[PDB]
Design a protein around this ligand. Structure first.
Ligand SMILES: CCCCCCCC/C=C\CCCCCCCC(=O)O
Ligand SMILES: CCCCCCCC/C=C\CCCCCCCC(=O)O
Ligand SMILES: CCCCCCCC/C=C\CCCCCCCC(=O)O
Ligand SMILES: CCCCCCCC/C=C\CCCCCCCC(=O)O
Ligand SMILES: CCCCCCCC/C=C\CCCCCCCC(=O)O
Ligand SMILES: CCCCCCCC/C=C\CCCCCCCC(=O)O
Ligand SMILES: CCCCCCCC/C=C\CCCCCCCC(=O)O
Ligand SMILES: CCCCCCCC/C=C\CCCCCCCC(=O)O
Ligand SMILES: CCCCCCCC/C=C\CCCCCCCC(=O)O
Ligand SMILES: CCCCCCCC/C=C\CCCCCCCC(=O)O
Ligand SMILES: CCCCCCCC/C=C\CCCCCCCC(=O)O
Ligand SMILES: CCCCCCCC/C=C\CCCCCCCC(=O)O
Ligand SMILES: CCCCCCCC/C=C\CCCCCCCC(=O)O
Ligand SMILES: CCCCCCCC/C=C\CCCCCCCC(=O)O
Ligand SMILES: CCCCCCCC/C=C\CCCCCCCC(=O)O
Ligand SMILES: CCCCCCCC/C=C\CCCCCCCC(=O)O
Ligand SMILES: CCCCCCCCCCCCCCCCCCCC
Ligand SMILES: CCCCCCCCCCCCCCCCCCCC
Ligand SMILES: CCCCCCCCCCCCCCCCCCCC
Ligand SMILES: CCCCCCCCCCCCCCCCCCCC
Ligand SMILES: CCCCCCCCCCCCCCCCCCCC
Ligand SMILES: CCCCCCCCCCCCCCCCCCCC
Ligand SMILES: CCCCCCCCCCCCCCCCCCCC
Ligand SMILES: CCCCCCCCCCCCCCCCCCCC
Ligand SMILES: CCCCCCCCCCCCCCCCCCCC
Ligand SMILES: CCCCCCCCCCCCCCCCCCCC
Ligand SMILES: CCCCCCCCCCCCCCCCCCCC
Ligand SMILES: CCCCCCCCCCCCCCCCCCCC
Ligand SMILES: CCCCCCCCCCCCCCCCCCCC
Ligand SMILES: CCCCCCCCCCCCCCCCCCCC
Ligand SMILES: CCCCCCCCCCCCCCCCCCCC
Ligand SMILES: CCCCCCCCCCCCCCCCCCCC
Lengths: 223, 220, 223
């Protein structure tokens, strides 16, 4: 079942990528850069999840299955999602690449701490987990603080859209570390199959859902 | 022999890099960025192939993983060089350029995974790599060539020449891979080794000689 | 002792990062990018050295390889060179080609170091030598074309660039010297001796350099 679920996921990623490509052909004032980002996210995730479906992107460690392909996915997909969110805030105004790369750095660090934590045992695991959570809190502070102020500097209509997609992504963000801690990688309260379904369903909303909402909102700003 | 061949290769890469540096001192209207790219490609490949010559860049079928370490950097830089050639004298399209870099990096990764795989799984990864290559070719002779044409007859003529040069070499690599030990195993290991010594000399050094000379000639 | 030393180091990095953040709040004409770089260096190094303190960022090869050092340097050292390059270009046109030239040389340098540490006999010193050649080219650029960029940006800027260039160059030569003398090389210096050198040097490079660098640029501020 775990294999079939990942095959299905990869197919939905492919469909998502194709949809964003078709949208890119009639861009409606959205720069090609934002369509490229929207396409890379699902395609990369799709490839990583295909490796799990083929039984390659996981191994046995500490007597538990480590789905290391998820970290290979996130280390690329999650910084790109933040870039998408940051460019949305900056839409119709001057770019702040310093702030954007601040978010990219925090996010990449976050995913790494996750991988190291999953390879770790006892107190050491939760030291790395904790550092990852601290990174996430700082990302959230930026998202609803200085990055939202950039959105507001670009007018009521843009700011309204940014706030919507900021809440969408932020809601999904907090789910991942919550599921991680509850699941076999952490306290082990949640069954392996339960975790697998969570990390199949969440990513469909993040890797495809977010960009549908994001791109449509920006396209609607077009006359 | 395999060791000696790789030593020789690395020395040719060094000579190539030195030639591009000398050219960079009298640039003839070519931006320093295009000389830097031309220098990094051979130097990086040289270092990777030196690891094979020293018997480090392989594990034992025998997997020459040092080739993937090479290509994951050298091949995206070659595509960047080709993209900047198309855009020479006009506005840059960094979105298209990074589109090609992304496709190429994915391509080389699929190759590495395929080499570590067995049976149907190997050819699923290989196939994904081929699909990436087809999309790169479509871009090269489609939208990227249109950018070249927008930059005048002389530039377009040069771009088309280097596009065909690189495209010819591109298709050779996955063909040799499939035929060789990593794939169907029809071609002998020594034959594959020579192919992945000779091809790269034309790609890592040859391409930039043709590319840079063609662009320098546009100064006159 | 080696574990405790690394814990202490990581704490000093954290303090350094916080200091640069506070400086960033009252920037005094220094762009946010240079504060971001100053913060990432110590935080990344701190995290890498924490992995050694927890006994994760090293393994046996008979002899002990502190591979977390290379994970640190491959990110921290190119960022230091970027900081130095942006200092030269302060108040003037940027040369990102030269900047990325230095990044490329530096990344190659650190890789040769790692490969050398994994190597034995003649092979080790071939890799080391290639790393030293990279360093020589970095020094030539630093006191050659990059210094000429500094000079083009006025007396006061050039004077500051020269001072931080000499500061960093002095530290640069120390690393490959300590490497060669220590267990990774000739093995003249004891393991504990090397560990202390690669704890003290980095405090001057990862925190010291940015203190001198940022203060010098902030002093140039009018009002
Ligand atoms: C190792 C891990 C590294 C992963 C990093 C990759 C993700 C980074 C993405 C940054 C994208 C920023 C592009 C800015 C677009 C500017 C524009 O649209 O004009
Ligand atoms: C792009 C995403 C890549 C996925 C990583 C796949 C790694 C597979 C390791 C080989 C496993 C095996 O065949 O035993
Ligand atoms: C965890 C390691 C990841 C580190 C990668 C990012 C490091 C940050 C480095 C440089 C910041 C780049 C800022 C670009 C400035 C452009 C000007 C602007 O628009 O603000
Ligand atoms: C973590 C939850 C998000 C906190 C948001 C704080 C806003 C910061 C600000 O307004 O500058
Ligand atoms: C909403 C949360 C969905 C999952 C809750 C059930 C957990 C099952 C388990 O313990 O494995
Ligand atoms: C597919 C998975 C997630 C769905 C996301 C939202 C559905 C599309 C809404 C489009 C819109 O808001 O205009
Ligand atoms: C610079 C490019 C070099 C990359 C390849 C280096 C490979 C080193 C592997 C050493 C392992 C061993 O000694 O067995
Ligand atoms: C993975 C590593 C990939 C490294 C290769 C990528 C480099 C692309 C360089 C693009 C530079 C374009 C700008 C040139 C210019 O403006 O003159
Ligand atoms: C890995 C790469 C994934 C995609 C990343 C985005 C980079 C896009 C660069 C945007 C440059 C805008 C300026 C231009 O189009 O000329
Ligand atoms: C190998 C075969 C693959 C295709 C080669 C190039 C396909 C045609 C390029 C696009 C043509 C165009 O858009 O004008
Ligand atoms: C040039 C000479 C060709 C030598 C023979 C080629 C062998 C290919 C099949 C193994
Ligand atoms: C940030 C840098 C991280 C250092 C890497 C941590 C080492 C991996 C864990 C190895 C182990 O548990 O044996
Ligand atoms: C790692 C490989 C480095 C090669 C990368 C290419 C250089 C790109 C720099 C772009 C320069 C923009 C214009 C300038 O300021 O010179
Ligand atoms: C991973 C990236 C590795 C990059 C390749 C390693 C070696 C790179 C060296 C190329 C840089 C040399 C440039 C020297 C000339 C600079 C100038 O023109 O002033
Ligand atoms: C040009 C400069 C490049 C070479 C620089 C340093 C060489 C140092 C290596 C000598 C160590 C040999 C010791 C040994 O083999 O026992
Ligand atoms: C061996 C040690 C070499 C290190 C120092 C080199 C000093 C370079 C002085 C400036 C030359 C650069 C230039 O003017 O082009
Ligand atoms: C990790 C996978 C990366 C794939 C990148 C997706 C590129 C798709 C093609 C881009 C469209 C450009 C066409 C313009 C005309
Ligand atoms: C496992 C034992 C670790 C004890 C030290 C923890 C220090 C954490 C600092 C952050
Ligand atoms: C990943 C660990 C970070 C350690 C602390 C770094 C320094 C403080 C950063 C604070 C960032 C806050 C930005 C939003 C201000 C409103
Ligand atoms: C206007 C002040 C911004 C505060 C926003 C609150 C933080 C959002 C919570 C994220 C989790 C969902
Ligand atoms: C006018 C044509 C000049 C061609 C010079 C070729 C230089 C080759 C350098 C080494 C390549 C191996
Ligand atoms: C059993 C052998 C199967 C080999 C599969 C090779 C085909 C891969 C796709 C080629 C694209 C043209
Ligand atoms: C050597 C491989 C060449 C592939 C490209 C051939 C088709 C190009 C079509 C261009 C249309 C004008
Ligand atoms: C076309 C690229 C060069 C091809 C070289 C082929 C050499 C094959 C030599 C085989 C010798 C016996 C193993
Ligand atoms: C693996 C070696 C197979 C022979 C070469 C196949 C065609 C590549 C171009 C010459
Ligand atoms: C607005 C200030 C942003 C501060 C973020 C600092 C980035 C640190 C990256 C983490 C690396 C460890
Ligand atoms: C085995 C530990 C791996 C940790 C990953 C560190 C990040 C990758 C290397 C630096 C970029
Ligand atoms: C192998 C690891 C790759 C190293 C890359 C680390 C990042 C260093 C690049 C610095 C770029 C910042 C300069 C931006 C210019 C500001 C305007
Ligand atoms: C002005 C365009 C800047 C190009 C960025 C350089 C790409 C970094 C290579 C990794
Ligand atoms: C890392 C090994 C590099 C070998 C040589 C590369 C080609 C020559 C580079 C010369 C750089 C000189 C820059 C300073 C100019 C004054
Ligand atoms: C046996 C202990 C010796 C430790 C010596 C440490 C020297 C530090 C000097 C830094 C430069
Ligand atoms: C850890 C070394 C710090 C050196 C800073 C020097 C004092 C500031 C000079 C201005």
């Amino acid at each position: 079942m775990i294999s079939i679920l990942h095959y299905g996921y990869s197919f939905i990623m492919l469909l998502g990528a194709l949809y964003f490509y078709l949208l890119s052909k009639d861009p409606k004032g959205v720069p090609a850069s934002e369509y490229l980002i929207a396409m890379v996210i699902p395609l990369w995730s799709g490839a990583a999840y295909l490796s799990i479906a083929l039984g390659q992107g996981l191994f046995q460690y500490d007597d538990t299955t480590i789905y290391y392909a998820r970290y290979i996915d996130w280390v690329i997909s999650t910084p790109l999602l933040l870039a998408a969110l940051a460019l949305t805030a900056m839409f119709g105004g001057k770019k702040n690449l310093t702030l954007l790369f601040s978010l990219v750095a925090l996010d990449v660090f976050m995913i790494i701490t996750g991988f190291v934590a999953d390879l770790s045992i006892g107190t050491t695991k939760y030291i790395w987990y904790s550092l990852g959570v601290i990174a996430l809190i700082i990302i959230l502070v930026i998202t609803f603080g200085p990055l939202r102020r950039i959105a507001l500097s670009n007018g009521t209509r843009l700011a309204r859209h940014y706030t919507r997609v900021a809440i969408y992504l932020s809601a999904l963000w907090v789910c991942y570390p919550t599921a991680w801690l509850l699941g076999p990688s952490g306290l082990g309260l949640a069954q392996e199959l339960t975790e697998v379904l969570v990390f199949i369903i969440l990513p469909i909303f993040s890797k495809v859902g977010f960009s549908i909402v994001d791109l449509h909102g920006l396209r609607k700003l077009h006359q």
